[PDB]
Amino acid sequence: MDKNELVQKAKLAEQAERYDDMAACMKSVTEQGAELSNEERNLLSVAYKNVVGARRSSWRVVSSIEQKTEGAEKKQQMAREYREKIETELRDICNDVLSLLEKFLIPNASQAESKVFYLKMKGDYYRYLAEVAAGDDKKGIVDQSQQAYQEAFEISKKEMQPTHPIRLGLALNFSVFYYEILNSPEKACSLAKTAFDEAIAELDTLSYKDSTLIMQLLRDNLTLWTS
Amino acid sequence: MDKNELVQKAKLAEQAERYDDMAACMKSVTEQGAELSNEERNLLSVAYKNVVGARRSSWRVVSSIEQKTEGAEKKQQMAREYREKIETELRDICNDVLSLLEKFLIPNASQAESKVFYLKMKGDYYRYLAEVAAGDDKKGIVDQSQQAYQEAFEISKKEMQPTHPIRLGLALNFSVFYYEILNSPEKACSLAKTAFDEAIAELDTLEESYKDSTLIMQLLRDNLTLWTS
Numbered sequence A: 001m002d003k004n005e006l007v008q009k010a011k012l013a014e015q016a017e018r019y020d021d022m023a024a025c026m027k028s029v030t031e032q033g034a035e036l037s038n039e040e041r042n043l044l045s046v047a048y049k050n051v052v053g054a055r056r057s058s059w060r061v062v063s064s065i066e067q068k069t070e071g072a073e074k075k076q077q078m079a080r081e082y083r084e085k086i087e088t089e090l091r092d093i094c095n096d097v098l099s100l101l102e103k104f105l106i107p108n109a110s111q112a113e114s115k116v117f118y119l120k121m122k123g124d125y126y127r128y129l130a131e132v133a134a135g136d137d138k139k140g141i142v143d144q145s146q147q148a149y150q151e152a153f154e155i156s157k158k159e160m161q162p163t164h165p166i167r168l169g170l171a172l173n174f175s176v177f178y179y180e181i182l183n184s185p186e187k188a189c190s191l192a193k194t195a196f197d198e199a200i201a202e203l204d205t206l207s208y209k210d211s212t213l214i215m216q217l218l219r220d221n222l223t224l225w226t227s
Numbered sequence B: 001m002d003k004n005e006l007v008q009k010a011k012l013a014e015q016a017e018r019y020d021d022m023a024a025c026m027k028s029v030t031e032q033g034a035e036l037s038n039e040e041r042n043l044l045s046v047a048y049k050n051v052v053g054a055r056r057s058s059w060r061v062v063s064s065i066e067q068k069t070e071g072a073e074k075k076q077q078m079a080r081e082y083r084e085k086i087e088t089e090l091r092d093i094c095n096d097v098l099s100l101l102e103k104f105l106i107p108n109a110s111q112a113e114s115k116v117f118y119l120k121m122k123g124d125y126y127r128y129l130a131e132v133a134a135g136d137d138k139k140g141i142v143d144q145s146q147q148a149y150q151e152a153f154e155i156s157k158k159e160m161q162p163t164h165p166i167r168l169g170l171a172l173n174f175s176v177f178y179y180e181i182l183n184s185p186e187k188a189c190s191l192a193k194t195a196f197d198e199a200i201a202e203l204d205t206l207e208e209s210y211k212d213s214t215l216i217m218q219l220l221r222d223n224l225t226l227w228t229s
């Protein structure tokens, strides 16, 4: 399977909702070492989002059951063991994505748009590791997530317009990092509100649907977190 | 791996929407050789329905895309080879289930209700093989589906009330077999209509678990509406 063929396969897999197949294809395209097109970048992101997402969803159910059963040490041990099984799958997915980002995607990123996208992505996957991390390793994983988001944030602020969907998307995920991982709701609200207001101010420079959708998500989090 | 632990793992897997895991647990439960409870056979059924379902849905997308490629032999060979990969996964799942049905489930079925349930299931999984079958094998696959359903149909008419959810569910799936596999719309409609009408008549003449029965009745009528253009 050569590049164009692997991309058409990934697109078939997407249509079939066979996301592990989709991820395998785009991993192989990425490993050929050439900078990904915008289309290929999105295919990779969609694939791994769904692959990791399935495990995250499962983890939340099994972790919720574990702690909603007071006593009954046979059933709690089972849920704990199944959570751990799911965690191993999730960690290996995140480490595969994070290895692709270090080796290929971030160093080859020749546009600010691309570099911000991949650094945001690095922040996300370290955040998914942080969701599942045990106390000892957690602080290091959380700092790795924060630094990836922060570098992405610096670059988008300098290079991209406030209405750009990748700049707005970064503000959404980084604000979520602050609220959910760092337990810093004031910082989360400040980041979200600033991104929203700066986008509102610069509505002259737009081209659209994605941008205003993310702005709505930002304000929804503000109202949720304010109450 | 004791029976009770495996059942609780299957329930965890179900909540996690990890249906391969769920099917593996219930496969192991079934292979211990003891007759399954109502709860256990439903867990087995739900697990495998979802496991095969994923591949069936994927097959319909990739098969459609293969037919939609008018003039592109490179993209069409790709779609065909991916369909074939999906088909082999699908057949292996169906044959797993059908093997559990022959070896353990149908032999140990001590009640008419469970006999009908497992024969319907046999009909379903041969029907899924029939959906994916090429001309050579298809006639034999289709006949095994029909014979499984037909035996289930006869036992259900003799032993169960018209409003029993298993009897109604059989009528639904058997009518779908006639419509989609044998292309016999008139037989599909008549089977589905008499099942609906006989259930409606039984509500007047005296039913316990309304919900499942009445839901299947709605699905029977929906098919009758769809199949009459």
Ligand SMILES: [Ca+2]
Residues within 6 Å of the ligand: A017, A018, A019, A020, A021
């Ligand atoms: Ca998959």
Ligand SMILES: [Ca+2]
Residues within 6 Å of the ligand: B017, B018, B019, B020, B021
């Ligand atoms: Ca699964």
Ligand SMILES: [Cl-]
Residues within 6 Å of the ligand: A017, A018, A019, A020, A021, A022
């Ligand atoms: Cl897959």
Ligand SMILES: [Cl-]
Residues within 6 Å of the ligand: A017, A018, A019, A020
């Ligand atoms: Cl998948």
Ligand SMILES: [Cl-]
Residues within 6 Å of the ligand: B017, B018, B019, B020, B021, B022
């Ligand atoms: Cl699974």
Ligand SMILES: [Cl-]
Residues within 6 Å of the ligand: B017, B018, B019, B020
């Ligand atoms: Cl699944």
